[PDB]
Amino acid sequence: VHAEVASFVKERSDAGEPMRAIVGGGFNESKEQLFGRQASLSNPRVSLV
């Protein structure tokens, strides 16, 4: 879902309509999960909590 939201935000922004997203995963996530998810979510206009 997070990759899709990143994709939707890119699709609207590249069309001239700027948009951004803030995202966070599950409960009590550990460091390894944050790095692995950041690497899988690397584009700008996206924030990870």
Partner 1 sequence: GGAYDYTNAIITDINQLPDFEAKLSPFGDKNLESSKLDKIENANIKDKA
Chain residues that interact with partner 1, rule: CB under 8 A: 31-33, 35-36, 39
Q: Which residue has the tokens 């995202």?
A: 23
For every residue of 1-49, DSSP letters joined together read -HHHHHHHHHHHHHTT----EEE--SSS--HHHHHHHHHTT-SSSEEE-
Q: How far is the CB of 19 from partner 1 (least distance, A)?
A: 27
- Residue (33 or 43) nearer to partner 1, CB: 33
CB closer to partner 1 out of 23 and 34: 34
Residue among 15 and 39 whose Cβ is closer to partner 1: 39
